[PDB]
Design an enzyme around this catalytic site. Structure first.
Site, PDB file in Angstrom:
ATOM      1  N   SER A   1       0.733  -1.466   0.011  1.00 32.69           N
ATOM      2  CA  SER A   1      -0.370   0.626   0.064  1.00 32.69           C
ATOM      3  C   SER A   1       1.004   1.273   0.041  1.00 32.69           C
ATOM      4  O   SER A   1       1.901   1.350   0.730  1.00 32.69           O
ATOM      5  CB  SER A   1      -0.886   0.251   1.624  1.00 32.69           C
ATOM      6  OG  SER A   1      -1.758  -1.029   1.352  1.00 32.69           O
TER       7      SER A   1
ATOM      8  N   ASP B   1       5.901  -4.511  14.942  1.00 35.44           N
ATOM      9  CA  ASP B   1       5.805  -5.484  15.682  1.00 35.44           C
ATOM     10  C   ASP B   1       5.289  -5.801  17.181  1.00 35.44           C
ATOM     11  O   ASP B   1       5.790  -5.112  18.058  1.00 35.44           O
ATOM     12  CB  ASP B   1       6.742  -6.304  16.353  1.00 35.44           C
ATOM     13  CG  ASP B   1       7.515  -7.372  16.857  1.00 35.44           C
ATOM     14  OD1 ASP B   1       5.965  -8.312  16.655  1.00 35.44           O
ATOM     15  OD2 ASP B   1       8.705  -8.596  16.395  1.00 35.44           O
TER      16      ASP B   1
ATOM     17  N   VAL C   1       2.929  -8.241  17.904  1.00 34.15           N
ATOM     18  CA  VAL C   1       2.857  -9.834  18.407  1.00 34.15           C
ATOM     19  C   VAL C   1       3.911 -10.913  18.820  1.00 34.15           C
ATOM     20  O   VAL C   1       5.005 -10.716  17.715  1.00 34.15           O
ATOM     21  CB  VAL C   1       1.705 -10.771  16.874  1.00 34.15           C
ATOM     22  CG1 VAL C   1       1.820 -12.117  17.018  1.00 34.15           C
ATOM     23  CG2 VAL C   1       1.021 -10.086  16.139  1.00 34.15           C
TER      24      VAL C   1
ATOM     25  N   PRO D   1      12.599  -8.980  20.179  1.00 32.38           N
ATOM     26  CA  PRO D   1      11.288  -9.566  19.535  1.00 32.38           C
ATOM     27  C   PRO D   1      10.901 -10.629  18.199  1.00 32.38           C
ATOM     28  O   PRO D   1       9.808 -10.831  18.515  1.00 32.38           O
ATOM     29  CB  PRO D   1      10.654  -8.339  19.612  1.00 32.38           C
ATOM     30  CG  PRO D   1      12.290  -7.385  19.167  1.00 32.38           C
ATOM     31  CD  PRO D   1      12.730  -8.250  19.774  1.00 32.38           C
TER      32      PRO D   1
ATOM     33  N   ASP E   1       8.296  -9.239  12.663  1.00 34.12           N
ATOM     34  CA  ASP E   1       9.351 -10.136  13.388  1.00 34.12           C
ATOM     35  C   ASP E   1       8.981 -11.114  12.116  1.00 34.12           C
ATOM     36  O   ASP E   1      10.002 -11.997  11.599  1.00 34.12           O
ATOM     37  CB  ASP E   1       9.534 -10.536  14.208  1.00 34.12           C
ATOM     38  CG  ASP E   1       7.570 -11.436  14.205  1.00 34.12           C
ATOM     39  OD1 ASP E   1       7.649 -12.630  13.437  1.00 34.12           O
ATOM     40  OD2 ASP E   1       7.024 -11.691  15.310  1.00 34.12           O
TER      41      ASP E   1
HETATM   42  C1  LIG Z   1       0.400  -8.607   5.964  1.00 38.60           C
HETATM   43  C2  LIG Z   1      -0.734  -8.692   5.307  1.00 38.60           C
HETATM   44  C3  LIG Z   1      -1.602 -10.345   4.796  1.00 38.60           C
HETATM   45  S1  LIG Z   1      -1.675  -6.934   5.302  1.00 38.60           S
HETATM   46  C4  LIG Z   1      -0.306  -6.552   4.134  1.00 38.60           C
HETATM   47  C5  LIG Z   1      -0.356  -5.716   2.980  1.00 38.60           C
HETATM   48  N1  LIG Z   1      -1.909  -5.307   2.934  1.00 38.60           N
HETATM   49  C6  LIG Z   1      -1.594  -3.730   2.765  1.00 38.60           C
HETATM   50  O1  LIG Z   1      -1.816  -2.884   3.255  1.00 38.60           O
HETATM   51  C7  LIG Z   1      -3.505  -3.192   2.648  1.00 38.60           C
HETATM   52  C8  LIG Z   1      -3.833  -2.316   4.292  1.00 38.60           C
HETATM   53  C9  LIG Z   1      -4.637  -1.090   3.916  1.00 38.60           C
HETATM   54  C10 LIG Z   1      -4.611  -0.133   4.563  1.00 38.60           C
HETATM   55  C11 LIG Z   1      -4.695  -1.155   6.179  1.00 38.60           C
HETATM   56  C12 LIG Z   1      -4.343  -1.880   7.190  1.00 38.60           C
HETATM   57  C13 LIG Z   1      -4.358  -2.608   5.163  1.00 38.60           C
HETATM   58  C14 LIG Z   1      -0.066  -6.565   2.271  1.00 38.60           C
HETATM   59  O2  LIG Z   1      -0.651  -7.343   1.390  1.00 38.60           O
HETATM   60  N2  LIG Z   1      -0.059  -7.727   3.984  1.00 38.60           N
HETATM   61  C15 LIG Z   1       0.236  -9.032   3.520  1.00 38.60           C
HETATM   62  C16 LIG Z   1       1.552  -9.396   3.446  1.00 38.60           C
HETATM   63  O3  LIG Z   1       2.384  -8.912   2.921  1.00 38.60           O
HETATM   64  O4  LIG Z   1       1.055 -10.945   3.918  1.00 38.60           O
HETATM   65 CA   LIG Z   2       7.282 -10.471  17.797  1.00 42.97          CA
END
Ligand SMILES: CC1(C)S[C@@H]2[C@H](NC(=O)Cc3ccccc3)C(=O)N2[C@H]1C(=O)O
Ligand SMILES: [Ca+2]
Lengths: 207, 557
Positions: B1, B73, B75, B205, B252
């Site tokens: 994003s 982080d 969690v 962490p 992490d």
């Molecule tokens: C951790 C996730 C499941 S979520 C993260 C990212 N998603 C976004 O940036 C969308 C978003 C925008 C505004 C607010 C929250 C999430 C995206 O894609 N990421 C995933 C990843 O790396 O596996």
């Molecule tokens: Ca952690």
């Protein structure tokens, strides 16, 4: 009056809700959502609560178990029960607005039921505040704010120590998975501020 | 994003400009939902994922807001001490404590139901148990107990009229999310929101902690500690899942890093190109970043140094020449499916070979696979989300920076060989691979372009539409699922704000029983592809002037 809700859709179909109290405003929102996205919302409800297999079969059992194992629904209900009347009105109005449209759908399905319900073989049921809350909790929180790989990290560290020795293996872990890297581009420039805490970087919790 | 917020000192013909591109993947019907709410203290317009009560992307005529994932982080995993003598208990603060448990039954369409138990401790739900070591792992979330509060904070923030009111709500949002602000006066701001644990001294962490009590979190850190800035001297706030702030630690996750190689630099280059940006120029950053190969800037210098003594006829040199003449922007040929330049394919093959020879070789199996990806991984349906610089490529970039890198190279990833030798060997592999596919005339190589798909299964992998409802776009664009722009105090209008978005395929997912799709089922698809946008209306007069239909409901609670 407090009972009136005006809904206006623009030239792209985007709805604008006009109301005089919290419950009525969120009721209009839920109503238009149930008009535009009922199947999507039903399937998001099942995804966030782990009840997909009920309608789609055995390919979704592990999915449903994984969803249910990753949350504690009674705790979310406890949070809802603690809300003030005003805050509860947001969730209750939304659910009540979706239900007013859902009840119309189920009264005249021959013209109002989204085709996907016929395709997938089931009909929509009503919503409660918990369900509305879980669309958010099950996406933003339980999926987009719930990322850790610490058990895998420990396995990598153990394998690095077995290959390189204890000290070099910890240092290679710090090369591949650094805690912080000072050359990282930062949204906030260093002139403005820097984070004031320093963290252990040698697994000292088990030293 | 991604997100760029341009403040008063960087904006041309306006006091502030906010452009957001949240990347969630692409779905049919649309991931987000357009909605305006007016009354009961609200006056807002925008769009939001899954029609949440709170609009994640929008404005209220005084301030505007947006988000990108935070990736802090928040969690940690606690290793609970079990005992075979006392099944269902764990050791905590000197006592054997009963786990909480619940039974769940999965009902199955055309199959047998399956019942299982979910277990939970003081440190969270149990993820897995190792009976050999009598250990159960519990996942501890700093936001546990604040999920509903977070939803409400995202709702109440829509009524804020200034930075103080807005940050009072930001302090109540407990998930790890970057929030952004702009206002009619040209102020801009950023908060990396959420709850973060106050960890005991010595707690790394990145790795699990014992759950017997001594390593329990002290509590939560205070909101003072969350990274934030208001009216930065740079005049802008840019993010593309990069670090919030110097010395702030990332998630992490082993395949997630904040290092010298970061795609956000492509946004900084564009924002710093000219002294100020108009709204049109700020919007155009979407188009350019969406087409930008992210590895060219990182590795071109290393490729140029390696090939600088070679003869004109050496193919390793000619592949680098080809890259040197290119800006890294991919464009479709007239056929609508191949890229005009072959550079991303050259970089993909080269980086794949480099990683195999360096980071992959240094890491034990099966962990090595974790570092072999080049970042150009996809499917014939195209990328499922944004494209980024891979973890292995970020680690390789520190190695090729030599002593310019702040990371100690505990293991030489080049294994004692001159880096030039390895770079050239990877170029020889690149020439062999690509010349065998395309022939020896690089000027006629028509390499395949990535495409984009609005999937009929939601991000969980669960149908949210029939398969035939999937939509396809020839050009993959590394951009927001939706894009929205808010312009404050334009000099080109008397209105305090102007705003636009795009919600593709369209606002409605409705299909009637007879198969007739709604009038608003697909009317934003072409606009999305062409980097167009529609007006977001706020005022009663603008909504009325652009009205298509209306309903009046009469309801008693
Ligand atoms: C951790 C996730 C499941 S979520 C993260 C990212 N998603 C976004 O940036 C969308 C978003 C925008 C505004 C607010 C929250 C999430 C995206 O894609 N990421 C995933 C990843 O790396 O596996
Ligand atoms: Ca952690």
């Amino acid at each position: 009056s407090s009972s009136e809700i005006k809904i206006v859709r623009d030239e792209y179909g985007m709805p604008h809700i006009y109301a005089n109290d919290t419950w009525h405003l969120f009721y209009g929102y839920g109503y238009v959502v149930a008009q535009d996205r009922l199947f999507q919302m039903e399937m998001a409800r099942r995804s966030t609560q782990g009840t997909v297999a009920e309608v789609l079969g055995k390919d979704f059992v592990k999915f449903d178990k994984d969803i249910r194992r990753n949350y504690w629904p009674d705790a979310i209900r406890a949070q809802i029960a603690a809300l003030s009347p005003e805050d509860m009105s947001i969730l209750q109005g939304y659910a009540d607005g979706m239900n007013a449209w859902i009840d119309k759908v189920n009264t005249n399905p021959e013209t109002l039921l989204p085709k996907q319900f016929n395709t997938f073989g089931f009909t929509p049921k009503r919503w409660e505040p918990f369900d509305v809350a879980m669309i958010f909790v099950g996406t933003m929180a339980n999926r987009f704010s719930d990322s850790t790989s610490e058990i895998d990290n420990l396995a990598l560290l153990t394998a690095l120590k077995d290959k390189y020795g204890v000290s070099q293996g910890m240092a290679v872990f710090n090369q591949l998975k650094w805690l912080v890297n000072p050359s990282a581009p930062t949204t906030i420039a260093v002139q403005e501020s820097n984070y004031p805490l320093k963290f252990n970087q040698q697994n000292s919790q088990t030293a | 994003s991604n997100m760029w917020v341009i403040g008063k000192s960087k904006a041309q013909d306006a006091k502030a400009i906010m452009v957001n591109g949240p990347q969630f993947g692409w779905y049919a019907p649309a991931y987000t939902y357009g909605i305006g709410l007016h009354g009961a203290g609200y006056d807002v317009t925008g769009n939001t994922p899954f029609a949440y009560p709170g609009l994640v992307f929008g404005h209220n005529g005084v301030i505007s807001w947006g988000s990108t994932a935070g990736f802090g982080d928040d969690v940690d995993i606690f290793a609970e001490r079990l005992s075979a003598e006392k099944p269902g208990y764990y050791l905590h603060n000197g006592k054997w404590v009963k786990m909480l448990s619940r039974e769940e039954t999965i009902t199955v369409k055309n199959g047998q139901a399956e019942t299982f138990t979910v277990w939970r401790t003081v440190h969270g739900n149990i993820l897995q148990t190792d009976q050999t070591t009598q250990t159960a792992y519990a996942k501890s979330r700093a936001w546990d107990g604040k999920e509903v509060a977070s939803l409400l904070a995202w709702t109440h923030q829509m009524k804020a009229k200034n930075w103080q009111e807005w940050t009072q709500q930001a302090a109540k949002q407990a998930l790890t999310i970057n929030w952004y602000y702009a206002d009619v006066n040209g102020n801009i701001g950023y908060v990396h929101t959420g709850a973060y644990p106050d960890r005991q001294s010595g707690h790394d962490p990145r790795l699990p902690v014992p759950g017997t009590g001594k390593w329990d979190w002290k509590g939560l850190l205070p909101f003072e500690m969350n990274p934030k800035v208001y009216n930065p001297q740079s005049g802008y706030i840019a993010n593309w899942a990069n670090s919030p702030q110097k010395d702030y630690p990332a998630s992490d996750l082993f395949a997630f890093l904040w290092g010298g190689a970061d795609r956000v630099t492509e946004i900084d280059r564009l924002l710093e190109q000219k002294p100020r940006l108009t709204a049109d120029q700020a919007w155009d950053v979407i188009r350019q970043t969406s087409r930008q190969d992210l590895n060219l800037r990182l590795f071109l210098p290393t490729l140029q140094a390696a090939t600088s003594g070679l003869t004109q006829s050496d193919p390793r040199r000619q592949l680098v020449e080809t890259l040197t003449r290119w800006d890294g922007i991919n464009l479709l040929n007239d056929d609508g499916k191949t890229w005009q330049q072959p550079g991303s394919a050259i970089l993909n093959v080269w980086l794949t070979s480099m990683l195999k020879r360096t980071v992959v070789a240094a890491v034990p199996m099966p962990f090595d696979k974790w570092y072999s990806a080049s970042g150009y991984e996809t499917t014939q349906d195209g990328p499922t989300g944004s494209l980024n610089i891979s973890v292995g490529a970020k680690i390789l970039y520190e190695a090729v920076q030599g002593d310019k890198s702040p990371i100690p190279q505990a293991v030489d990833l080049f294994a004692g060989k001159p880096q030039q030798e390895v770079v050239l060997a990877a170029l020889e592999d690149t020439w062999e691979t690509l010349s065998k596919r395309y022939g020896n005339n690089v000027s006629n190589w028509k390499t395949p372009a990535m495409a984009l798909t609005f999937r009929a299964n939601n991000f969980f992998g669960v149908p949210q539409a029939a398969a035939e409802e999937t939509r396809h776009q020839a050009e993959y664009q590394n951009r927001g699922t939706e894009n929205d722009m808010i312009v404050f105090s334009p000099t080109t209008s008397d209105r305090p704000v102007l705003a636009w978005d795009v919600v593709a395929p369209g606002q409605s997912g409705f299909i009637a029983p007879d198969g007739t799709v709604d009038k608003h089922y697909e009317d934003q698809l072409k606009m999305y592809e062409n980097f167009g946008r529609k007006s977001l209306w706020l005022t009663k007069q603008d909504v009325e002037a652009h009205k298509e239909s209306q309903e009046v409901l009469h309801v008693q609670r």
